[PDB]
Ligand binder design. Structure first.
Ligand code: W0F
Ligand code: MG
Ligand code: ZN
Ligand code: ZN
Ligand code: ZN
Ligand code: ZN
Ligand code: ZN
Ligand code: ZN
Lengths: 479, 576, 44, 45, 49, 87, 257, 8, 98, 67, 82, 93, 115
RNA sequence: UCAACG
């Protein structure tokens, strides 16, 4: 050509091989903004799909498997070597980029409820619980058996009827939250009978037992693994994402009647807000919808290799024009509620949508007068421990800005760790106090008359005592 | 050690005293809900059932609380506990004797959270005061918190997996504090910038621009439906703008009913021609810009981000300043409902048809790039001949980079302008950019014409390999393509080298985001700790805890930041 | 108290505190058999 | 130890962590579960 | 005997090496499973480079 | 309960006097035993002193009927044989 | 102030498809009829499954779902059957349900495809649209699936398993004349199959006086009901909904006054 | 990703 | 026990001495999806500390063309410090120089 | 894992057509021709058959848990 | 201080309105007599709002000046911020 | 401008430039507990103990730590009951 | 876990009224009808037929919230006409239209078959 | 400890 270099010594096999495993599943990567490719690489790791074909044999914690995986209609050539066709993660979905009722605003997504009823994006969640019968204790033996309230001095009031004789619930029995999956008893040394040691289901699991296995582990003790299965129909909190970095929850679910419908009768399975596309500049999503429409009509899986030069938007548009649709992919839509044609023509086409592991059921938590920590006598932390949400220092600064002194007081003292102490008036140091005896005396002064009750957070009491242990005296004087 | 426990974050001093985990708090994913008002939040039933607000039994409410007690924990509008005068707590779940269920004045029934219970809604990080706002509770039958879309801007929250915290005040005193200090309608206007925090956003902004155009005419039935969603409608149908041949209302005529009371405001649309004000047709604007609202009626103009957004002098800001906070809450909600129901008739979309431009425009873009590459080549040849003269204060390398960047940037902007000229009225990218809902002229240009120069650390793409950016390029190549210029648009698709360079630029963006979060957090905390105790005393002096006078009057004029407005003195500038 | 065996799929009844080993194969991986009580599944 | 019920077995609870008289529902002990919280090798060290 | 060395799955010294896909199915191991991970104490651990 | 409720209006900080430490500590004669367990569970004059604090969530400490909530804990003293600098 | 008198012409009538044109009708009525096709035509489908043995690879709830989606012939018996809530008998009885029973075990080496033909109904009228077959599950040798199921009357508003139709095609104003949809470029858009215009003209000239009329339909069936029967039952069911409203409205009007 | 004066 | 311990804990060293141990090696394999399994197996971890916010080790470098994926990096506190190999990249096993 | 009954978008029964689709592919029909012959016309229905991945055969390869 | 020479603002501050309404409502919930006739108002906070409008709340606000003195404004005397 | 001017006034009020750091903020003669919440913590407490410093308890953070009502808004004033007004009016309940 | 049962959308729970008629104080001769457990299907037909009536000045229907199941229909009629009368007459007219349509569809079916 | 979520 016009001379640039005449001394090439090597040549690239194909430029698309610069991308990795997760970025190779992106269709038309070169038509996306770079941060969006980076975000899709992370989201693709969290999608749901058949992780491995031997999943029935495996007993893994937190395994999700989609009901009806489908291979992409618009696929990269390098996907074949990643085996994505063999074990797909996601379903091709008729996606309309439109503003319908305002429930797809921000990044949310309106989903078709009728499609959801027909199996769309339905998944199973398997959770495995492991327990070991440990006889290592000198006089402690953690035998597997069904605990009895009368026989066992230590027991709990959750349901124990499910447990069989072996102490392990049979497969095929429904288990609701706070039920006993495995019943175990530690024999109690009679210092002078039983401290309950059963394992309880995570709250709101609401599943059916799938497999129960009894073996001997590496240590030789009896080992039992119990796998609980819970189907997961998509809801209005679940997170769905495409292959181009567009992630969003499900805003609301409309039935097929309510969804907008083309003249052929096709109603979008998913409606995404048009406002997501422009700022993010994920044009690859649009080109994939066009190529998907063409591929579904033609009957051949589309090619979306990053750098091709034989596939252009114009060529795809002409191909679609052959099959009777508008060349740019827009379709005349009718409003489901009223039947009137929507004045703007909505862009409808099939697009591979994925279902991420983050679901609303796993992320919903509420706390009200729950258990408290030992050290601080403050509410616990975490969803598993029914922990309260932390009122951070930034939060207290916001409340200071509000001027809501009493809400700040409630939230930081009364709701968390209320406590009362008795403090000598003469010396600020706390004084011994027997409420039942009604005798209150202060050591170091030999004074009983001058003692005052002080209400402080238990954490503040702990701080003052730790200061005293460092020989600092925090003498709190009411005067 | 003791010092180790106290000293670090999450120690007793800070992690357990200044902030601590609290009861009566809940958290779940947030999802949109246009139908809810600004102050309402949608709480799932399970979260509402676990959380309980204790109510004192009075002679007025003994019957209602008795019914709640009878229902028990199982039925949703029930009571979890009864707290007697003695302090004894009767958990109703485990069987209480029928004697215990009887209530007398002074008992405290802990009812389940019901519709209308004031709560505080929070989203971490709580950067500013508007990030904790008091919301009324509306119970809806799914498991996500649902908040109105306008309230997303104060919280900086979008519905892509975000989560928020729900704190329920447990006393009448603190409930009144929230109700009268921190409710969402009360904090529409921020004292930080004396501007409204919340504005019409997303579909409602894009659709309000289209609704308010001169073109929009609504027939009788459509007006009926739109008026149905207007909460403050007087019940009187406005006389149609076009009585004959067929009665047809206009978009502005209906939006005039949304506007609260009698509000007078003049703002300009984004596409306002600069010459219009000086020339004729200043008042009869040809393009229907220059929004004017007289007597609470939209006389003319196309509404956009400037009129209904979060900026000083906006229609929402004038409503809050003039009508009050309650009517302004109704204003936000009514705009959203009516416009969102019109959007079902009109509709919005984004497709490839928007990205594609005319063939002539593509040829013009290509020619601009051709002549730009030629100019860069000429600059390079001048530099090689040493004919280039150094700019004062700059090395010859620096001045070469300056001139090359100027040529490339001029070409980039010119191609962008050609693409923007190509856009038709119907183009949806233009709808969103013009309305201000999302996007920018830059994004349109990169979508249609030219992605632009990729810069890392303030320079073109550096020579990572020995004297060349990538192995494919020849050593000592300072040309446009070699150093990073991406000639192709996103629609056209980046060539492989440009793909890698674009990835480098995007990675710089990601790194900057990650770094800025941490550094700004530290700065914010230090400022708060330094100034936490400063407050306006009843002398109206601003004093700290020590009672030292920081200021004799707050702001030197003793006025709060939210009430003030921008104004022109008008005695200053004119000549004698 | 009937345990199906992984290796040879033959049910073997095992009493409490009895070694978990399947007769006729010796495998130590047993599965508990499906419960007799029946669960109603909505087709939904 | 329900005061109105001599020799009454108080049922344990997990939700709030308290022992409650089953026949009247009185909460005896408010938050008295908290968290509720190798000896073989050698001895005390 | 001087000890035991953990074996990365599907390497040359693993049992699964050189087994036809039908044989892998007979062992209840997936043919598509990549290998490259150790099974230590019952959990599959991957050595990040 | 009979003591009036008061709110702290001033917190005075000072180094604790060794004499005051001796008087204040419930433990008398110091902690003579490194072991925490005597008579099976409780070691008088040991690290886990019944008088020092409530143990096992059901016991009552000797000094007051805390029942794991009322008792704020009580300090003990160790009489060092030779003085040591405080860090 | 009275109802328009509609007309119907049936252009195509096949075993799985009905095309008809409703004229002299309001848009709201036509769209409501289309809506009732999808969501308010009663059909019999499986809603209760008790699985006795399931050795298949698909788990139990998977099998129940697939069974529910299987269409069942409900041409004439659906009118006779009562909703389970209406029936006085506890749970399910022959008047309020139909019992389907499935027992299949694979003893041959070859894979056994459990199909809808293996579902056996106690009532002859309700059969799984067999008179290929829908594949419930595939079974390897030594795997067995035995289940018992009852089918209940219901409509699509509850679940899509009761949706009679496959796709209901609704179109009015085939050549844009009321300008309900404003094409940015009229020429690019493909002409409708019902369009009466010549190839040269893309859109018909605007008619301000005109209002939507002559709505075009194309109803396709899953085999659960005859495609004619879907339309007739939808019309009848919407009429019943309106009549129930009228009864309750009369009660309220009389009670207030 | 735009230019030197813009954003990366 | 030495090999098993270092693999299970993720600390590279001995049980008694954790001063020279390097954490982060030998993570549990992710099995959410086959893509996640494959990517976890083909992963590189730069030793630079996450706490340090200096941006030089994080930025994509020109020499990563074809050796490391440009797009695939975790977004958060570890942007650019965790990298995934490209499809064709092959790390050298090693040989004698004799 | 197995061909879905009732194509998601519209609801046409597509579970009875998988084996016929595979057979028509064996008869050297192109995928588009096979889809046309099976009666699948709308692109929503064609998506179901075209993009389906039949994993249940791979799962059937494993020996049964109970014989 | 004396009743004369009151230097604080006559208008009731927003924080005072919040605390007065909350405190009066808490009293009303504990069966305190209500000055304003209630038109079927059962919620204590709403009754307190009615009382504040009527300026019949029986609370006197003691405002602490920074010098240590206090000025006692009754709720009636203060002009409601609304 | 109010918010900028307040920060500038706090930094320059003492007469020496007070950095918003542990050094500048903690050097100012605030209460020892308030200094304890910011950065230095234990060292501030030890110094205060050595010199016999007393915490005035007028700060917001100090009151928050001890669980008392803060001196912030809604805590600046103390409400008192008005007996004469209680007698007047219609005492319906 | 908080998902409503499917039958809630169309089944009236005990103690719920299908129609409740509340007058509108703002404007004369206007009534606001609330229909429970109904959706756009019924509402749109009723509103359209009401609009066809010359004596009906205003007619519209509103679903207050899609998650809840309720229709609110506002009808305003001229004096000498009542909103309740307009609602009943609208229902009669829609029933007549549907009956006529059924007869004609049956005739079309019979003609298409064997003809 | 590690890994995700904003
Ligand atoms: C917009 O700002 C938010 C907040 O500032 C908050 N946030 C998030 N991560 C952090 C963190 O690590 N530390 C702190 N302190 N705050 C953090 O998240 C920021 C944005 O992040 P993003 O840029 O990924 O948002 P997309 O633009 O990506 O939204 P799509 O289209 O996916 O919905
Ligand atoms: Mg977000
Ligand atoms: Zn004392
Ligand atoms: Zn065996
Ligand atoms: Zn009792
Ligand atoms: Zn004690
Ligand atoms: Zn029956
Ligand atoms: Zn279909």
């Amino acid at each position: 050509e016009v001379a640039y270099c005449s001394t090439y010594t090597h040549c690239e096999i194909h430029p698309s091989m610069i991308l990795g495993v997760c970025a190779s599943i992106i269709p038309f990567p070169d038509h996306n903004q770079s941060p969006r490719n980076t975000y899709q690489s992370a989201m693709g790791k969290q999608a749901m799909g058949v992780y491995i074909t031997n999943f029935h044999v495996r007993m893994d914690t937190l395994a999700h498997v989609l009901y009806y995986p489908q291979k992409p209609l618009v696929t990269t050539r390098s996907m074949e070597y990643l085996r994505f066709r063999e074990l797909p993660a996601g379903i091709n979905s008729i996606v309309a980029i439109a503003s319908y009722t305002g429930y797809n605003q921000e990044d949310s997504v309106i989903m078709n409820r009728s499609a959801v009823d027909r199996g769309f994006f339905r998944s199973v969640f398997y959770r495995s619980y492991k327990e070991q019968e440990s006889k290592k204790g000198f006089d402690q033996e953690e035998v597997f058996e069904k605990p009895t309230r009368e026989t066992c001095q230590g027991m709990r009031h959750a349901i124990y009827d499910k447990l069989d004789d072996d102490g392990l619930i049979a497969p095929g029995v429904r288990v609701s939250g706070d039920d006993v999956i495995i019943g175990k008893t530690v024999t109690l040394p009679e210092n002078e009978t039983k401290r309950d040691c059963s394992t309880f289901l995570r709250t709101s699991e609401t599943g059916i037992v799938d497999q129960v296995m009894v073996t001997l582990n590496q240590e030789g003790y009896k080992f039992c693994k119990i796998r609980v299965r819970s189907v997961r129909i998509p809801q209005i909190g679940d997170k769905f994402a495409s292959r181009h970095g567009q992630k969003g929850t499900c805003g609301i679910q409309y039935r097929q009647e309510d969804m907008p419908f083309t003249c052929e009768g096709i109603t979008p399975d998913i409606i995404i807000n048009p406002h997501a596309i422009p700022s993010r500049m994920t044009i690859g999503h649009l080109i994939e919808c066009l190529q998907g429409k063409v591929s579904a009509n033609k009957g051949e899986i589309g090619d979306a290799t990053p750098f091709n030069d034989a596939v252009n938007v114009q060529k795809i548009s002409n191909l679609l024009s052959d099959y009777g649709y508008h060349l740019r992919g827009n379709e005349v839509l009718y409003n489901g509620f009223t039947g009137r044609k929507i004045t703007s023509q909505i862009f409808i086409g099939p697009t591979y949508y994925q279902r991420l592991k983050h679901m609303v059921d796993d992320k919903i938590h509420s706390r009200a007068r729950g258990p408290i920590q030992i050290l601080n006598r403050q509410p616990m932390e975490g969803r598993s421990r029914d922990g309260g949400l932390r009122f951070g220092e930034m939060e207290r600064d916001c409340q200071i800005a509000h001027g809501a002194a009493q809400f700040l007081r409630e939230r930081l003292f009364e709701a968390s760790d209320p406590y009362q102490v008795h403090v000598c008036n003469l010396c600020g140091i706390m004084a011994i106090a027997n409420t039942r005896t009604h005798t209150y005396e202060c050591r170091g002064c030999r004074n009983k008359t001058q003692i005052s009750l002080v209400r402080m957070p238990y954490a503040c009491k702990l701080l003052f005592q730790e200061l005293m242990s460092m020989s600092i005296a925090p003498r709190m004087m009411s005067v | 050690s003791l010092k180790q426990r106290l000293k670090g974050k999450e120690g007793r001093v800070r992690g357990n005293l200044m902030g601590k985990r609290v009861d009566f708090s809940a958290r779940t994913v947030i999802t949109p809900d246009p139908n809810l008002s600004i102050d309402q939040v949608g709480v799932p039933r399970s979260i509402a059932a676990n959380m309980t607000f204790a109510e004192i039994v009075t002679p007025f409410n003994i019957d209602r609380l008795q019914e709640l007690v009878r229902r028990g924990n199982s039925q949703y509008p029930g009571a979890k506990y009864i707290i007697r005068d003695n302090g004894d707590r009767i958990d109703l779940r485990f069987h209480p004797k029928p004697s215990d269920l009887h209530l007398q004045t002074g008992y405290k029934v802990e009812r389940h959270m019901c519709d209308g219970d004031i709560v505080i809604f929070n989203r971490q990080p709580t950067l500013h005061k508007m990030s904790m706002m008091g919301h009324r509770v509306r119970i809806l039958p799914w498991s996500t918190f649902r908040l109105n879309l306008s309230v997303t801007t104060p919280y900086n929250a979008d519905f892509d997996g975000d989560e928020m915290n729900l704190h329920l005040p447990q006393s009448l005193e603190t409930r009144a504090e929230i109700q009268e200090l921190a409710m969402v309608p009360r904090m529409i206007v921020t004292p930080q910038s004396n501007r409204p925090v919340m504005g019409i956003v997303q579909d409602t902004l894009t659709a309000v621009r289209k609704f308010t155009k001169r073109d929009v005419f609504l027939e009788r039935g459509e007006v009926m439906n739109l008026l149905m969603f207007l909460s403050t409608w007087d019940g009187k149908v406005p006389q149609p703008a076009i009585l004959k041949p067929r009665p047809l209302w206009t978009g502005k005529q209906i939006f005039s009913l949304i506007i609260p009371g009698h509000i007078n405001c003049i703002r300009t649309h984004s596409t306002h021609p600069d010459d219009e004000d000086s020339g004729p047709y200043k008042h009869i604007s040809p393009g229907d810009t220059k929004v004017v609202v007289e007597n609470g009626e939209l006389i003319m103009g196309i509404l956009c981000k400037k009129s209904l957004g979060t900026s000083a002098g906006s229609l929402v800001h004038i409503s809050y300043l003039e009508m009050g906070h309650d009517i302004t809450r109704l204003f936000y909600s009514n705009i959203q409902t009516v416009i969102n129901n019109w959007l079902l008739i009109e509709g919005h979309t984004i497709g490839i048809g928007d990205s594609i431009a005319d063939s002539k425009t593509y040829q013009d873009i290509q020619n601009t790039i051709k002549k730009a590459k030629q100019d860069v080549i000429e600059v390079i040849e001048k530099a090689h001949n040493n004919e280039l003269e150094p700019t004062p204060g700059n090395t010859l390398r620096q001045t070469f980079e300056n001139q090359v960047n100027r040529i490339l940037n001029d070409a980039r902007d010119k191609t962008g302008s050609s693409a923007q000229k190509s856009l038709s009225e119907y183009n949806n990218f233009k709808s969103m950019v013009v309305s201000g809902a999302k996007g920018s002229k830059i994004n349109i240009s990169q979508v249609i014409a030219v992605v632009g120069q990729q810069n890392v650390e303030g320079k073109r793409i550096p020579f990572g390999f020995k004297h060349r950016t990538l192995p494919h390029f020849i050593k000592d190549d300072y040309g446009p393509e070699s150093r990073g210029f991406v000639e192709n648009s996103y629609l056209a698709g980046l060539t492989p080298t440009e793909f890698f360079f674009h990835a480098m630029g995007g990675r710089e963006g990601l790194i900057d985001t990650a770094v800025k979060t941490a550094e700004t957090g530290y700065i914010q905390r230090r400022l708060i700790k330094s100034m936490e105790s400063v407050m306006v005393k009843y002398d109206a002096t601003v004093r700290n805890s020590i009672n030292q006078v920081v200021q004799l009057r707050y702001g030197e004029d003793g006025l709060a930041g939210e009430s003030v407005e921008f104004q022109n003195l008008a005695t200053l500038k004119p000549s004698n | 108290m009937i345990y199906i065996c992984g290796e040879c799929h033959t049910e073997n009844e095992i009493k409490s505190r009895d070694p978990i080993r399947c007769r006729e194969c010796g495998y130590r991986i047993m599965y508990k058999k499906r419960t007799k009580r029946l669960v109603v599944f909505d087709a939904r | 130890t329900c005061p109105n019920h001599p020799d009454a077995i108080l049922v344990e609870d997990y939700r709030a962590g308290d022992m409650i008289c089953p026949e009247c529902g009185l909460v005896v002990g408010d938050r008295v579960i908290d968290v509720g919280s190798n000896p073989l090798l050698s001895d005390g060290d | 005997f001087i000890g035991k060395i953990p074996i990365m799955l599907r390497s040359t010294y693993c049992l699964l090496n050189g087994l036809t896909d039908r044989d892998l199915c007979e062992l209840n191991e997936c043919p598509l499973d990549p290998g490259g991970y150790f099974i230590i104490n019952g959990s599959e651990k991957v050595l990040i480079a | 309960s009979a003591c009036p409720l008061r709110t702290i209006k001033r917190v005075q900080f000072g180094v604790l006097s060794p004499d005051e430490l001796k008087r204040m500590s419930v433990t008398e004669g110091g902690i003579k035993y490194p072991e925490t367990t005597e008579g099976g569970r409780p070691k008088l004059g040991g690290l886990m002193d019944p008088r020092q604090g409530v143990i096992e969530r059901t016991g009552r400490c000797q000094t007051c009927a805390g029942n794991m909530t009322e008792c704020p804990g009580h300090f003990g003293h160790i009489e060092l044989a030779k003085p040591v600098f405080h860090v | 102030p009275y109802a328009n008198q509609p007309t119907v012409r049936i252009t195509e009538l096949t075993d799985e498809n009905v095309k008809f044109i409703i004229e002299n009708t309001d848009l709201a009525v036509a769209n409501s009829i289309r809506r009732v096709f999808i969501a308010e035509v009663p059909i019999i489908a499986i809603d209760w499954v008790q699985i006795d043995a399931n050795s298949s690879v698909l788990h139990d709830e998977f099998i129940a779902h697939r069974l529910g989606l299987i269409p069942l012939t409900s041409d004439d018996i659906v009118d006779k059957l009562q909703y389970s809530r209406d029936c006085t008998c506890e749970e399910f009885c022959p008047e309020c349900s139909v019992e389907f029973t499935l027992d299949v075990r694979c003893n041959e080496d070859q894979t056994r495809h459990v199909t809808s033909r293996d579902l056996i109904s106690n009532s002859p009228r309700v059969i799984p649209v067999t008179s290929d077959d829908i594949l419930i599950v595939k079974l390897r040798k030594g795997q067995e699936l035995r289940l018992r199921a009852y089918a209940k009357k219901g409509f699509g508003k509850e679940h899509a398993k009761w949706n009679p139709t496959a796709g209901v095609a609704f179109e009015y104003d085939p050549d844009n004349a009321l300008r309900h949809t404003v094409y940015p470029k009229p020429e690019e858009w493909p002409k409708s199959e019902y369009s009466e215009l010549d190839e040269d003209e893309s859109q018909a000239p605007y008619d301000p006086n005109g209002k939507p009329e002559r709505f075009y339909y194309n109803v396709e069936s899953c085999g659960s009901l005859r495609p004619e029967t879907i339309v007739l039952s939808a019309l009848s069911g919407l009429k019943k909904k309106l009549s129930d409203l009228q009864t309750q409205l009369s009660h309220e009007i009389q009670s207030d006054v | 990703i735009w230019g030197i004066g813009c954003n990366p | 026990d030495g090999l098993k311990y270092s693999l299970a804990t993720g600390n590279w060293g001995d049980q008694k001495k954790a001063h020279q141990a390097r954490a982060g090696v030998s993570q549990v394999l992710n099995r959410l999806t086959f893509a996640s399994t494959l990517s976890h197996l083909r992963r590189l971890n730069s030793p630079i500390g996450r706490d340090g916010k200096l941006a030089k080790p994080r930025q994509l470098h020109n020499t990563l063309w074809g050796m490391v994926c440009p797009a695939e990096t975790p977004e958060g506190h570890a942007v650019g410090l965790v990298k995934n190999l490209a499809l064709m990249a092959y790390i050298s096993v090693g040989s004698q120089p004799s | 894992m197995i061909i879905p009954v009732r194509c998601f978008t519209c609801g046409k029964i597509v579970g009875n057509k998988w084996e016929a689709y595979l057979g028509l592919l064996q008869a050297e029909y192109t995928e588009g021709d096979a889809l046309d012959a099976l009666g699948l016309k709308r692109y929503c229905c064609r998506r179901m058959l075209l993009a389906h991945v039949d994993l249940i055969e791979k799962l059937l390869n494993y020996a049964p848990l109970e014989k | 201080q004396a009743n004369q020479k009151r230097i604080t603002t006559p208008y009731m501050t927003k924080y005072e309105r919040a605390r007065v309404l909350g405190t009066r409502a808490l009293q009303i919930a504990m069966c305190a007599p209500v000055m304003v006739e209630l038109e079927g108002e059962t919620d204590p906070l709403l009754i307190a709002m009615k009382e504040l409008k009527a300026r019949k709340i029986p609370i006197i606000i003691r405002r602490y000046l920074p010098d240590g003195s206090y000025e006692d404004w009754g709720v009636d005397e203060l002009i409601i911020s609304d | 401008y109010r918010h900028l001017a307040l920060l500038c006034d706090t930094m320059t009020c003492r007469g020496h430039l007070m950095a918003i750091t542990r050094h500048g903020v903690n050097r100012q003669d605030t209460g020892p507990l308030m200094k304890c919440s910011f950065e230095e913590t234990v060292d501030v407490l030890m110094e205060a103990a050595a010199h016999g410093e007393s915490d005035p308890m007028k700060g917001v953070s100090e009151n928050i730590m001890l669980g008392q009502l803060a001196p912030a808004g809604t805590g600046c004033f103390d409400l008192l009951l008005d007996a004469e007004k209680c007698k007047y009016g219609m005492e319906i309940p | 876990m908080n998902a409503p049962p499917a039958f809630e959308s169309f089944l009236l729970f005990e103690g719920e009224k299908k129609i409740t008629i509340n007058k509108d104080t703002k404007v004369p001769n206007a009534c606001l009808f609330t229909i429970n457990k109904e959706d756009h299907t019924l509402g749109n037909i009723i509103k359209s037929q009401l609009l066809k009536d010359p004596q009906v000045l205003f007619a519209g229907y509103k679903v207050p919230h899609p998650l809840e199941h309720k229709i609110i229909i506002r009808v305003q009629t001229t004096p000498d006409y009542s909103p309740q009368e307009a609602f009943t007459n609208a229902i009669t007219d829609l029933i007549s239209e549907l009956s006529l349509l059924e007869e004609r569809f049956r005739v079309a079916i019979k003609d298409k078959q064997e003809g």
